[PDB]
């Protein structure tokens, strides 16, 4: 992979990683452990970005075609729920504390965390760090290199898409799909140029 | 109103009792661990003639060795606690 043909890929990016297109011009992953931590971080930020972006765009599209009246993502938190946002935050914080500390221990030591602390009978098969599998993969799909680099690709696209959503909402004041529609309406008179 | 004599005597009694029976060994032990000295030798070995420990005054025929000095010390604590209680109960302080 060549992100900039033909710029020589850094020595520490030997293509032994999925998504290796030789893109690290600032040399952040010059250190091996740094490269590991950043691989994990790219996977995580990427997956959460995919989920988040999906949850931002998809409900709005279905609202446009009148399937279900769903409030936009930036106006969804405002006082509509049963348990209130504070309680929700405490719950979230607790469960995420447990889960993320767990995964963290997996990153610090791969084989250290794999079995259920309560029901020690059940366990997760020794796999790759960042790719747990086992119960996390009930449909038993093969973790091929292609599938991994596809995951990372859609992840990067979704991250950029999230930045796009944030900035676009910050400027226009409408939803991303709304902006897309207005762009379809008159492309040469509805861009970042006119909105600013 | 509290009787000054009863408070003072009872306080001093409690202090002297505490020093004679319940805190005596500990005090004697810690004192055994400490003694003032300059450059290894004591103040009298140095020597300042006015820094010799009084052997006569510290002497006592008490079973454990409770002397006049301990009486003055624990007695002092006793009177202090006593007058603290008296002065405190005398005021009209209200928080």
């Amino acid at each position: 992979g060549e992100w900039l043909p033909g710029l020589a890929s850094p020595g520490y990016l030997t293509g032994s990683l999925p998504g290796d297109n030789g893109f690290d011009p600032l040399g952040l992953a010059e250190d091996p452990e740094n490269l590991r931590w950043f691989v994990q971080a790219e996977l995580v930020n990427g997956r959460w970005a995919m989920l988040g972006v999906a949850g931002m765009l998809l409900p709005e599209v279905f609202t446009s075609i009148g399937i279900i009246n769903v409030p936009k993502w930036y106006a969804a938190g405002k006082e509509e729920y049963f348990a209130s946002s504070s309680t929700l935050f405490v719950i979230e914080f607790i469960l995420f504390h447990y889960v993320e500390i767990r995964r963290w221990q997996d990153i610090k030591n791969p084989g250290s965390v794999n079995q259920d602390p309560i029901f020690k009978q059940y366990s997760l098969p020794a796999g790759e760090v960042g790719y747990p599998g086992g119960i996390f993969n009930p449909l038993n799909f093969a973790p091929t290199l292609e599938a991994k680099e596809k995951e990372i690709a859609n992840g990067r696209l979704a991250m950029l898409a999230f930045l796009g959503f944030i900035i676009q909402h910050n400027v226009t004041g409408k939803g991303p799909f709304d902006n897309l529609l207005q762009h379809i309406s008159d492309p040469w008179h509805n861009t970042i140029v006119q909105t600013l | 109103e509290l009787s000054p004599s009863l408070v003072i005597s009872l306080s001093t009694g409690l202090s002297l009792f505490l020093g004679r029976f319940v805190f005596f060994n500990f005090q004697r032990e810690n004192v055994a661990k400490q003694v003032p000295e300059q450059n290894g030798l004591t103040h009298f070995e140095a020597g300042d003639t006015r820094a010799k420990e009084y052997v006569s005054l510290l002497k006592s025929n008490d079973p454990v060795g409770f002397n006049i000095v301990d009486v003055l010390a624990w007695g002092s604590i006793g009177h202090i606690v006593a007058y603290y209680i008296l002065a405190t109960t005398s005021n009209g302080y209200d928080p």
């Binding site: 600032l26 040399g27 952040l28 250190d31 740094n34 931590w37 | -």
Partner: protein, 151 residues
């Protein structure tokens, strides 16, 4: 309000200062032909002035009895722009500079004549290390945990 101060948009002395300033500018403006350059200059000063006062009022600044903006740096969330934010920006830029300089000094430390590249700058090297500063918190944070920051 905070510290017994009064908001600039509500401060009378603030407004009186704007008044006296504009009136001084106009009192100076009276002597020049309206189309001439001095006139346009003084008028530009007037517009800039009132825009300044209006902006300070809009920014939510608190004024003293003097009629001047006083700053709140306690960490108060209504005034993060009065120290916290520009502070963060500063720290970012300064860290950038220092980290880049550090990179440059390390890069030439192992050479025949290091002092040379300290009196005659290796501009290609400097340009290569220039943008590395953009990620200085990340780069330094990792070097901190690694043990490559100190000896």
């Amino acid at each position: 309000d905070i510290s017994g101060l009064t908001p600039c948009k509500e401060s009378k002395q603030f407004a009186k200062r704007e008044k006296q300033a504009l009136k001084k500018l106009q009192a100076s403006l009276k002597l020049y032909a309206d189309d001439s350059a001095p006139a346009l200059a003084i008028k530009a000063t007037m517009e800039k002035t009132k825009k300044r006062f209006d902006n300070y009022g809009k920014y939510g600044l608190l004024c003293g009895s003097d009629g001047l903006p006083h700053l709140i740096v306690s960490g108060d969330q209504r005034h993060w722009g009065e120290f916290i934010t520009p502070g963060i920006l500063f720290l970012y830029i300064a860290g950038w500079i220092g980290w880049v300089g550090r990179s440059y000094l390390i890069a030439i430390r192992d050479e025949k004549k290091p002092t040379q590249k300290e009196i005659i700058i290796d501009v290609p090297l400097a340009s290569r290390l220039l943008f590395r500063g953009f990620s200085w918190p990340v780069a330094a944070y990792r070097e901190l945990l690694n043990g490559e920051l100190v000896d």
